Amino acid sequence: DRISWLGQPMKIEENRTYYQKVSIDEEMLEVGDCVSVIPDDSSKPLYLARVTALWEDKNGQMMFHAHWFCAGTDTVLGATSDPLELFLVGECENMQLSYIHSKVKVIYKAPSENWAMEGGGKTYFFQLWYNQEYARFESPPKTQPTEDNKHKFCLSCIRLAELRQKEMPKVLEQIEEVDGRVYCSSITKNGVVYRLGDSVYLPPEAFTFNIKVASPVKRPKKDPVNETLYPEHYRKYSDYIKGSNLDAPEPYRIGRIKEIHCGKKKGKVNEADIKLRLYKFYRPENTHRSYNGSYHTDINMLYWSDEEAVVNFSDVQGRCTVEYGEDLLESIQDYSQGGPDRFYFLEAYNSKTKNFEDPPNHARSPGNIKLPKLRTLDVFSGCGGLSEGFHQAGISETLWAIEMWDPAAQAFRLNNPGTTVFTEDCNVLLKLVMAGEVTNSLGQRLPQKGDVEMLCGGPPCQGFSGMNRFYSKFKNSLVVSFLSYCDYYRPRFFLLENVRNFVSYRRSMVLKLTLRCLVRMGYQCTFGVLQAGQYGVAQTRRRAIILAAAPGEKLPLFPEPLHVFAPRACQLSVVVDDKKFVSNITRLSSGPFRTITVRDTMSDLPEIQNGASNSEIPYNGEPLSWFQRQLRGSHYQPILRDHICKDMSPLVAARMRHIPLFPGSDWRDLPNIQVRLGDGVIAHKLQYTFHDVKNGYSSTGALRGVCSCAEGKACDPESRQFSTLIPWCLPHTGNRHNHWAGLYGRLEWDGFFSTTVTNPEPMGKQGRVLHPEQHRVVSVRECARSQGFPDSYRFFGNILDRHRQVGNAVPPPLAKAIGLEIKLCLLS
Amino acid sequence: DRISWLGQPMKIEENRTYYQKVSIDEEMLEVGDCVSVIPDDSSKPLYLARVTALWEDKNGQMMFHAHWFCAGTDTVLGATSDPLELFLVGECENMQLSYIHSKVKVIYKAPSENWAMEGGYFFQLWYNQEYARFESPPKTQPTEDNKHKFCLSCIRLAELRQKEMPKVLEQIEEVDGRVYCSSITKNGVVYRLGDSVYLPPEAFTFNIKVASPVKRPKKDPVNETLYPEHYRKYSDYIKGSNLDAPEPYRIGRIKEIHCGKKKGKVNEADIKLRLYKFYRPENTHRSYNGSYHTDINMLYWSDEEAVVNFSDVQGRCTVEYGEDLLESIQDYSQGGPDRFYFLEAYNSKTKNFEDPPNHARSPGNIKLPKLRTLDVFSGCGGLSEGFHQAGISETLWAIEMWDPAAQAFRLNNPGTTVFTEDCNVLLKLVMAGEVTNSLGQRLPQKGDVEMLCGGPPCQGFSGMNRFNYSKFKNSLVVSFLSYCDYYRPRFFLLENVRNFVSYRRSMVLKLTLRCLVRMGYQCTFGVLQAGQYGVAQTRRRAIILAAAPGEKLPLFPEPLHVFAPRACQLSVVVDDKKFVSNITRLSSGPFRTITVRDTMSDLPEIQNGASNSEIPYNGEPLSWFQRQLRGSHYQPILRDHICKDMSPLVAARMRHIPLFPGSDWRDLPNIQVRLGDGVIAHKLQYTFHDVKNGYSSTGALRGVCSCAEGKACDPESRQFSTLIPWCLPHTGNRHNHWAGLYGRLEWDGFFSTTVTNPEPMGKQGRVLHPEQHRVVSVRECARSQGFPDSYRFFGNILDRHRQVGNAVPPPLAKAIGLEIKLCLLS
DNA sequence: ACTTACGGAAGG
DNA sequence: ACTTACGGAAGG
DNA sequence: CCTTCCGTAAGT
DNA sequence: CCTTCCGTAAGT
Ligand SMILES: Nc1ncnc2c1ncn2[C@@H]1O[C@H](CSCC[C@H](N)C(=O)O)[C@@H](O)[C@H]1O
Ligand SMILES: Nc1ncnc2c1ncn2[C@@H]1O[C@H](CSCC[C@H](N)C(=O)O)[C@@H](O)[C@H]1O
Ligand SMILES: [Zn+2]
Ligand SMILES: [Zn+2]
Ligand SMILES: [Zn+2]
Ligand SMILES: [Zn+2]
């Protein structure tokens, strides 16, 4: 209605008149309070904001600035949120007081000073800051208003100004202006300082190399496949090769900043358009050697060039460190392992000579705190792939572990000699500590409040695994059991791992309540899906990661990818209630390092026949790639362990011998032949005595059905065929299972593994488990190679037992990647 | 913590000590106040309830009765709901005072006495989770006896289950453990001896045993060179088919009622009924062939007996002997529901018809004001024609921007002020105080409108169009709500296509409902199948009902005709909460299904491209359905029985479509035809592999473009003027092989959704006559829509086709309107 | 025991 | 004009 | 429409 | 996987 100002205006500017208090419809309003307003544009029924400023413009209007809140429904929580709970966000507006519905009351629920020891009309409340882009619940900032700020204080305006000034490119020191163009010394953007002589990441389309690409050769169809010798090849019109890096992008371009120039705009320097001319760096796969010489070289070795190219400062992804070999005060192994984005070069590459030099002298550089490991409790430890990676980050000593499966707990003790491993049921053991008992029946000391500083685990996946056919279920579940451990112990850091479909299970409900509980605990928290193949292994393995940090700590961000990977497998987005959420990761284009492949994974292992049982055989050679050198160490070790194969049936064995070697091969290439096996057993041909209404007749007029369902009828028993080389069940239900692609399939050397399983079977849903050339299933060591386990890591039990230990495991590279991000928050 | 009573205790039962006030942890609680409690078994994070009783048990603890509330997110509204709005539910439980977290204050927000002239925590409505019905709260109030445990949830529960339970009224004689009765009741329906009752078709047999011999299957092999697209019919599905259609209800005449006894009293839970089997004309030896012309409510008496359970009783119907009637049988059957009649009787051994015995004979052997209704998006007027068929409203105003629909509306409504302006413009003139428009037509204003109805454009939500909050703020569905906001009628109807409540993941629905709750309107929604109300067309439409606070919210009409179960899936789900209408008839119904033969068997044979707008009937009506739309008065002239003039190539396609049920384009031969002058229809050439469909039986290919081999579509591969349309095998595999295109309806079948332009190569292209080589006529589309032959249209043949397409069937509108009638009484 | 035998839906 | 030409998702 | 992928139960 | 269905825009 009519709205009058209260008291003398405070901190008025020459063109804007801030006040202190106002009265709406005979109400009382002042800085600190909060206000409701009805929307014009959204599905929401009402908005809630916070007062900020109190100014009347010279135009005659009276407006005020408003720091909007966030209903729990507006967040990832949705309907499971607390209807009395709000969150702080980075939305802010300046608004006329006539839109004020009227005054609300929101109270700040700060975490207790005894927070780590707990866990045994309408009035709103807030406790944490929400960022809708990456779905991150963070503790609110602690910066305060001063004399300059008291009338304008808007935390959302400050976060916007600090972030935008951070993101803006800026020239720091400029050398000399020449005829309209000003040359620069040092520039910066996104908080990164760039100077002359630094190297820099650029996308692959930034510049080419002067060595001409070899692309004229094209591969036509080899021949028309016979449809009676190969009566199931017709199911391969897919033109899709599983686990192949043909669509894998090329890694970052790297150049040495020769010089920086730009332009002018309105008398001042045009910082928005900065140009960089660099010396191109040659990845070994960019020389005339290209990929076929790219097998033994390190992933961070480059080749100096004198070629030049001009690129925009806008395309700079980041800055990397590249040094010449002889100038380093330490080794190259200790230099590469001392930090990220660290490259090196020993020679130089001439485009015309196609030889390697001593690089010129203008490429040579100038001269031409004990970290406390965190006491960690690893629930569902398995073999310890998750805890091993955290150790590789050097941030944690896992003191306790819970693993009900016996072979997994034993293998865990083998690799962690200072961990008290419980084989109890996790909920049986937690109840023991709630009863006040010190040890279990065997005398193992139970961890108490204050002992564990980080809690991590990977609960069973078989419930949310998108492979198997078949509220208080969540309240009795194992993931809620893992949540009361964090509720009881109140650790400083929390990490939960599961398969990517963990956050789409039951219409995304399980995660909606998984973070719903952490925020009621006052925990900072966030989630996201990560591809293990982006962090050093040759396996597509998307796993959902839930991070959480105590209010006194800083919430970690997700690790940014190190290796490029096939794009169809790095789709890391997550949709919940039509709101798409992403991780804080900024590397989608490409990455610093080449993708890890199967040859970098297994090319050094000796040839074994199907059914290997020798648990300790010698290496007949030395590491053949950078990846193998990482897992075998540099110390002399001749014994290769766990390189054993499953003993398959003579029928299955015969099937694998007839799988072609060429990439993409699988069961659909098997011949319809008769082979006789061991003793007097005979493998029969497959009879096609039924019409396939959908698949029709063959090139030879033969039929393509093996049962009566192929004609639309009910499946008839006794039409089932046995001991066939072409398995009977795959053409049986192939039409509605994408022709069972990948089964009895081979990995390719230039490709990568699928998600490595707990039991490798060529006729299971993920059956791409044949060796690229050998007629055998993948061995236990080859699986942990694809899982990133060092060759020093040991497992326990029979062949199947140690297989499942590898399959259930978090890849240590993924855990090391995450672990490093947690260390960054340990500082300051 | 510590809980103490305060005040004198109220009336105390044998084991329960009622109190009025009590103090738990420094607060004081009175009956009628509200409390918050924390949940442990629901995904919802808090529950709120109003305290109704304050007793203390005999075991020692002190308890209280809590009538739970309904959060707006708990409802169909979900996240859009007003967050401080709650609704009343029939949920209640008794609990300890130890679970009380807080004491909330919720107040009743009643509609003002000046509520209809407006439009320029709290609770107001009652929510029914099963049917998604926001109703006004009950006016039941407490008296001294009930005031200590007064829970509206419990008396609505008690009256519900007691109306639902069977009960014996009048007992007769008790004989050796079995007591015979003369009156029983359930579901509020009283049953007496001599009455007839509905029962499922699985209730009893007939002594005429039906013949079902395995007629000839797998007749011949079809030449895949002559018919190279026949292989696409492996689905064994024919659309518009009534072979999976259930049988209507079984009807029998109660002659004796008996039951047992449990613990000395009657066992009303197990009541038995002995009936006289009634013979539908399709149950006699004539069967379906003989039951074509007979009424849908004529039965045949039989002395066959059968005993069935009273738990199987679906409803009561009234069956009278024909000659015992005081009126005609048309005045009788058109005078009420569930009304059947019989004139003869059927003997199953003799297999012909007698005159019924004397014991089958019967004993002797207020002007309602119509509503002033405004019909926005009137079209030709099919919606308000149905309302007038129910006799509940004279539609005085109407809005229709398309001229041929507004003209055709006036031709059928002579006393309606039809505005052809834009709906947004017209209300804007009412907002400015304008009396008339540019033409001098008086504008309706508040008070004049008693009912607002309309069918907004379906083109945005329809599931055939490809190119699908601000858009909601602009659209006509909110334009139609501002009319509801200004005039504030007593009743409100919104019609649209089924997926209106699935558009944008059910957000259009949740916002259409939320606005009516904010204006104080009772409201609900549901999906209805027009084929369940007397037409031979599957036409699922979402219906949104609303009622002023002072009125009573109507319920959805219960199906009158059985229909194909595949097209009557009326349930809708929004945010994984499945909602359904109040309909109770699912398996079967009172009347058989209306079929194509019942709809066009009387209309004369016409060639393709007819323009003769006024032709005579070739005889009399040939069914009950036609006799309803042609009237008892002598009318010799048939209107709008014209079909679209098709191209000579299209003309040749229709002639080559087999007449046997389920035929469509996939049966066309691949040959040449000589057309007008020297025009030739060229053959179709298969010069590409189809990697998904493989080779034929003759070794020929099944692809017509490079895409069939997985390549990019090659132009210059397109074939023109060929009998088998080139575009149909081109994109068939990812379009269900284009089932229905150039398809024929079945006489024993029903129409698909009759659209605005019948073209056989459209998405729904089974628009060919069951026998004639032509597309259905304008009248035949009006017959499938349930229009009387008395109804006039306007414009060209296309403008007429659109008028019948976008109209909502008057039968369905009549079904809804009768339910609105039952609220105007009492 | 071990080898065969096989839902979906969810995203894309 | 009018005859052809065809993306879905959402449910079952 | 096609591709994803820490599989289990029914068969013998 | 298979059926639903008050279609519209590209092209003659
Ligand atoms: N109730 C329970 N209590 C403790 N461990 C359990 C359990 N139920 C299943 N487990 C074990 O938990 C293990 C999870 S495997 C996960 C291991 C870890 N993510 C890694 O990287 O190695 C399974 O091997 C399973 O045997
Ligand atoms: N802006 C507008 N104002 C008034 N009518 C409109 C309009 N936009 C479209 N229409 C008309 O609304 C009509 C809906 S057809 C529905 C008519 C009615 N349900 C019946 O049974 O007959 C369409 O024919 C269309 O011409
Ligand atoms: Zn701001
Ligand atoms: Zn079969
Ligand atoms: Zn009650
Ligand atoms: Zn094509």
Cross-strand pairs, A256 = A199, A279
Specify whether the CB–CB gap between A403 and A380 falls below 8 A. yes
A729 is known as an active-site residue: no
Name the residue with tokens 């299904």. Answer: B593
The answer to whether the beta carbons of residues B785 and B535 sit under 8 Å apart is: yes
> What tokens does A300 get?
């961070």
Angle between helices A509-520 and A478-489 (to 10 degrees): 10
Residue B40 contacts by C-beta under 8 Å, 6 or more apart in sequence?
none
**Set of chain A residues whose Cβ sits within 8 Å of the Cβ of B697:** 697, 701
CA/C1' separation B764–F5 (Å): 6
A426 is in an annotated binding site: yes
Nearest protein residue by Cα to C1' of nucleotide F2: B736
Angstrom distance (rounded) from CA B270 to CA B772: 56
Task: Name the closest ligand to CA B719.
Answer: 6
Read off the DSSP letter of residue A405.
Answer: S
* Contact criterion met (CB below 8 Å) for B624 and B602: no
CATH architecture assignment, domain B124-147+368-600+787-826 = 3-Layer(aba) Sandwich (3.40)
- Which residue matches tokens 């299957």? B217
Mark residues 784-823 of chain B whose C-beta is closer than 7 A to nucleic acid strand D: 798
Residue nearest to atom 7 of ligand 1 (CA): A404
Q: Find and list the nucleotides of strand D having atoms within 7 Å of a protein beta carbon.
A: 2-12
Nearest atom (ligand 1) to Cα of A388: 21
d(CA A781, CA A791): 8
User: Taking phi first (over 0 means left), then psi (-120 to 50 degrees means alpha), and beta for anything else, what does residue A679 get?
Assistant: left
Closest Cα of chain A to B318: distance in Å? 46
Strand A181-189 and strand B196-199: pairing? Answer: unpaired
Distance (Å, whole) CA B238 – CA B240: 7
d(CA B378, CA B808): 10
CB B372 within 8 A of CB B446: no
Say which CATH superfamily domain B1-123 falls into. Answer: Bromo adjacent homology (BAH) domain (2.30.30.490)
Choose the CATH number for A151-206+248-370 among 2.30.30.100, 3.40.50.300, 3.40.50.150, 2.30.30.490: 2.30.30.490
B212 vs B142: CA distance, rounded Å: 63
Task: Tell me the β-bridge partners of A85.
Answer: A125
- What's the alpha-carbon Rg for chain B, to the nearest Å? 31
Contact A651, A789 (CB under 8 A): no
Compute how many other C-beta atoms are within 10 angstroms of the C-beta atom of residue A408. Answer: 26
Beta bridge partners of A576: A579
Q: Cβ atoms within 10 A of the Cβ of B209, count? A: 8
Chain B residues touching A694 at Cβ < 8 A: 234, 692-693
Number of other CB atoms surrounding residue B210 within 10 Å = 8
Q: Which of A387, A403, A424, A796 to mutate to test the pocket of ligand 1 (most atoms within 8 A of CB)?
A: A403
Exposed, middle or buried by CB within 10 Å (0-12, 13-18, 19+), for A517? middle
- CA–CA distance, B567 with B584 (Å, rounded to integer): 17
Query: Can you point out the beta strands (E) in B188-235?
Result: 189-192, 196-199
Distance from CA of B703 to the nearest CA of A (A): 13
Please give the structure tokens belonging to residue A542.
């998307």
CB B746 within 8 A of CB B797: no
Q: What is the crossing angle of helices B507-518 and B476-486, to 10°?
A: 10
Rounded CA separation A505/A468 (Å) = 13
Residue B422 labelled as part of a binding site: yes
3-class SS letters over B34-96: EEEECCCCCCCCCEEEEEEECCEECCCCEEEEEEEEEECCCCCCHHHCCCCEEEEEEEEEEEE
Q: Among B114, B30, B27, B106, which residue's Cα sits nearest to residue B71?
A: B106
Nearest CA-CA partner of B20 in B137, B153, B123, B150 = B150
Q: What residues flank ligand 2, with Cβ below 6 Å?
A: B 377-383, 399-402, 405, 422-423, 455, 457, 476, 495, 806-808
From start to end of A19-118, where are the E strands? 21-24, 29-30, 34-37, 47-50, 55-57, 63-71, 85-96, 103-104, 106-108
H or E element that contains A631:
helix A626-632
Q: Return the closest-CA partner of residue B240 out of B593, B669, B501.
A: B593
CB distance A450 to A474 below 8 Å: no
Cα-Cα-Cα-Cα dihedral of A498, A501, A507, A511, to 10°?
20
DSSP state of A62: B
Three-state DSSP class for A335?
A: helix
CB B793 within 8 A of CB B800: yes
- Any bridge partners for residue B715, and if so which? none
DSSP for A94-125? EEEGGG---EE-EEE-PPPTTGGG------EE
CATH code: domain A1-126 is 2.30.30.490
CATH code matching the domain that covers A603-788, chosen among 3.30.420.40, 2.60.260.20, 3.90.1140.10, 3.90.120.10: 3.90.120.10
Alpha-carbon gap, residue A401 to B541, rounded angstroms: 59
State the CATH architecture for A127-150+371-602+789-828: 3-Layer(aba) Sandwich (3.40)
Judge: B45–A121 Cβ closer than 8 Å, yes or no.
no
Considering only CB atoms, which chain B residues are within 8 Å of A517? none
Torsion of CA A780, A786, A790, A792, to 10 degrees: 10
In whole angstroms, give the CA distance from residue B604 to residue B602: 6
Among candidate residues B618, B673, B615, the one with its CA nearest the CA of residue B640: B615
Phi, psi of A649 (to 5 degrees): -70, 155
Can you read off the two tokens belonging to residue A476? 């009795």
Instruction: Report how far residue A528's alpha carbon sits from residue A539's, in angstroms, rounded to the nearest whole number.
Output: 19
Q: Which of A36, A102, A693, A698 to mutate to test the interface with B (most CBs of B within 10 A)?
A: A693
- For residue A267, say whether it is annotated as part of any ligand binding site: no
Question: Quick one: which atom of ligand 2 is closest to the CA of B379?
Answer: 17
- Start-to-end Cα distance in chain B: 51
Quick one: three-class SS letters along A676-717?
ECCCCCEEECCCCCECCCCCCECCCCCCCECCHHHHCCCCCC
**A517: phi then psi, degrees, rounded to nearest 5:** -80, -40
CA separation for the pair A87, A515 (Å, rounded): 14
Kindly state the greatest CA–CA separation across chain B: 106
Is any atom of strand D within 7 angstroms of residue B597's beta carbon? no
- For the record, the structure tokens of A232 come out as 């199931």
What is the rounded CA–CA span in Å between residue B200 and residue B187? 17
- CATH 3.40.50.150 in chain A: give the residue spans: 127-150+371-602+789-828
Distance, in Å, from the CA atom of B634 to the CA atom of B616, rounded to the nearest integer, reads 12
Work out the angle at residue B751's Cα, subtended by the Cα atoms of residues B749 and B755, and round it to the nearest 5 degrees: 175
Residue A450: φ, ψ to 5°:
95, -20
Check B511 against A237: CB less than 8 A apart. Answer: no
Q: For chains A and B, what is the number of CB pairs under 8 angstroms?
A: 95
Give B5's strand partners: B22
CA distances, A361 to each of A257, A324, A364, B737 (Å): 15, 10, 5, 71
CB contact at 8 A, A612 and A758: no
User: Do B755 and B772 form a contact (C-beta atoms < 8 A)?
Assistant: no
Element (H, E) at B384: helix B382-389
Task: Name residue B570's amino acid.
Answer: L
Q: Residue A77 in contact with residue A68, Cβ under 8 Å? A: no
Pairing of strands B371-376, B451-454: parallel
Element (H, E) at A675: strand A675-676
Look at ligand 1, atom 10, and give the residue with the nearest C-alpha.
Answer: A404
Distance A697 CA to ligand 6 centre (A): 22
Experimental determination approach used: X-ray
How far, CA to CA in Å, does B600 sit from each of A629, B608, B780, B784? 84, 16, 6, 9
Q: Maximum distance among all alpha carbons in chain A? A: 106
Give A676's strand partners: A682
Of A237, A513, A692, the CB nearest to B691: A237
Using CB atoms within 10 Å of the CB of residue B752, give its burial: 0 to 12 exposed, 13 to 18 middle, 19+ buried. buried
Q: Which of B453, B458, B484, B781 is catalytic?
A: B458
Strand residue runs (E) in B229-310: 250-262, 265-277, 305-309
Q: Which residues of A touch B234 (CB under 8 A)?
A: 693-694, 711-712
Residue of A nearest to B691 (CA): A237
- Other C-beta atoms closer than 10 Å to the C-beta of B774 total 22
Q: Is B720 exposed, middle or buried (0-12, 13-18, 19+ CB in 10 A)?
A: exposed
Closest CA to B823 of B559, B516, B386, B490: B490
Residue nearest to atom 17 of ligand 1 (CA): A382
Residue numbers in B 412-471, CB below 7 Å of strand F: 455-459, 462-467
Resolution in A: 3.0
Q: Which residues, listed in sequence order, are joined to residue A130 by a DSSP beta bridge? A: A137
Residues in B closer than 8 angstroms to A516, CB to CB, are 45
Residue at B281: amino acid letter? P
Separation in Å, CA B735 to CA A100, A235, B233, B760: 53, 21, 13, 15
Tell me, what amino acid is at B607? Q
> What's the CA-to-centroid distance between B159 and ligand 5, angstroms?
12
Residues 6+ away with beta carbon under 8 Å from A170: A187, A188, A189, A271
Tokens of B129: 């989770």
Nearest to B423 by CA among B371, B475, B470, B473: B475
For helices B403-412 and B797-806, the axis angle rounded to 10 degrees is 70
- Pick from A420, A519, A683: which is nearest to A76 by CA? A519
Among 3.90.120.10, 1.50.10.20, 3.40.47.10, 1.10.10.10, name the CATH number for the domain at B601-786.
3.90.120.10
Atom of ligand 1 nearest to the CA of A405: 26
Which residues neighbour ligand 4 (ion) by CB within 5 Å?
Answer: A 707, 709, 715
Contact A209, A280 (CB under 8 A): yes
Cβ neighbours of residue B266 closer than 8 Å, sequence gap 6 or more: B168, B171, B179, B259
Q: How far is it, in rounded angstroms, from Cα B362 to Cα B321? A: 7
Q: Where along chain A do the CATH 2.30.30.490 domains lie?
A: 1-126, 151-206+248-370
Q: Ligand 1 within 6 A of A404 CB?
A: yes
Cα separation, B533 vs B563, in Å, equals: 9
Contact B704, B687 (CB under 8 A): yes
Pairing of β A85-96 and β A124-131? parallel
* DSSP states along A181-230: EEEEEEEEETTEEEETT-EEEE-TTS---SSPP----------PPPTTTS
The bridge status of strand A47-50 relative to strand A34-37 is antiparallel
Residue of A nearest to B508 (CA): A43
Query: Measured between alpha carbons, how far is B421 from B434 in angstroms, rounded to an integer?
Result: 15
Residue given tokens 């203390």 in the structure block:
B56
Question: Nearest Cα to A448, choosing from A457, A460, A435?
Answer: A435
What class, spelled out in words, does domain B148-203+245-367 have in CATH?
Answer: mainly beta
